[PDB]
Amino acid sequence: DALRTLIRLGSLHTPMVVRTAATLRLVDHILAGARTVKALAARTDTRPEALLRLIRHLVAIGLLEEDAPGEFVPTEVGELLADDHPAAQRAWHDLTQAVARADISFTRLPDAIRTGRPTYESIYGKPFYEDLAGRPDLRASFDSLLACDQDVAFDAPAAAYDWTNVRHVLDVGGGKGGFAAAIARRAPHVSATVLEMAGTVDTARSYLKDEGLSDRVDVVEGDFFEPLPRKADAIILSFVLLNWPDHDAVRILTRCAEALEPGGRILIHERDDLHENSFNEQFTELDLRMLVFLGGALRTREKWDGLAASAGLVVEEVRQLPSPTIPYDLSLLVLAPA
Template structure:
């Protein structure tokens, strides 16, 4: 494979080889799971020392690290000794972007990524493959397994104040009294809203496991007097009415029929004159960076298919979904860029038709 790559360097063949390589993505996930970057930074810089602290085979581990050095994650600082590059440093456990936690095979997303081995099944059926691999749908799995659920909450809280600041600043909260955050665990977005708009009180609804963790988190933040947390299922009749129902990165988890059912439940929970506000991934931008934005959009879209059976929607698709739920799109604020993530969000406001 290496000689073929060299023969076709810079050609379509080179591009195809880089695209079909499953070795590097899996090698990165193994490095993240074994915490190789942290061990290197702690002084274990050769394969025997790294194998000792990771309980792995020295020869096999050396071959893994040698490949990751070839692709620029690590570099050989002296014969047989390795250190992380700037790319490799992103895999440090305490790095603020938490890439190790996204990739590690014992963490929720890295674990779920293994469902891509059944992508052909997902494409053939339009159904997620996560349950076939782990025995339960994704959200049920996270709700039933406290360790997985807590790890997912921590991942979703990565740089959350900076991520939330832009969409919160872009929306007019001045007339909002009660925000009902449906599926809102671990509660970070509603906490940010409450801090930005002191007149707002809030309610979070989620499955029992996430609801319990969210209640504890909100109490620790000193906001329990302003934010209630309820355990429930958003496919059932919602127990609270509010003048603003918030769905933050929720509907991308579901296919259109299920997403429309959720929207109808939210519509029925509105006070007269109320609105539904979605925070979702923005559709790819047009212009010179279209390939980059297309890639982030499509990666998440395929993850939603394989993990959950959901989809990431374009603005036109949001209009169609709103109409199917008896709603009208009243505003779209897009794109909303954040300095800490490489993709854009959007805010979509809907009202009863």
């Protein structure tokens, strides 16, 4: 049939079961020596009968399976919730850490389609980044999720750009500094500056120090809506612009253009797609998180020309690049003065 296909697609059960299995460290406790439902219940601090009801469903959707009678063991797919796995999917689905917490915003998607405005504040009391400002808790969990891949996520985009005439790089909203770090060990003559918010700057400083790069890369606390701290031959916006509606994203773009030295470029590292090619799960899954968390968006190639020009810029070239960690393709846009 395919009335079972519709029920599967509309199932709230399943993702909530995946996410509670992750929050409870379920797969980790089985691998650590929890053979029985009783031991698993002890380790997770759950009721044995209700845990068995959770594992019924974890078996049905393919994440656990019975080996011996009443003895449950992670499948290939279930093993991906192991906390030491490099894709960190367990963290990304933990209801205590920042991203899965924010997905609760989807419970009010109808509002966001009605208004075009984010849902997050109506649930948690503040807009997304102000919330993180007042919870060191989720500040740190968010930074660690997005930089879970730090050591390799930026190797490819840095390899695809020519750094020969670049003396200084500004990484605007550059996270824990990973993109600055990848450009640095790719191009030894280059120095860099990371601009980020409070919390994230201290964590960026310690990561850069621990890479051996504190002499080549500074971190500066600030606000990319105000003038940028320095001038630069290349300015990076990796996963920033999608957080903001058009007007805000043109303001950020415009501040970057003002900070560009003669001949420099701006590199945008997120995701886009030709309009006709945009009707896919990768583009939609991020575009809609951006709507509901932030009032942001992903933008098509065509829509990027419009934003570029509002900021006195042209889109010069676009490559697509694969993530080394997760099933997802990224885009690197290079923008020049018009």
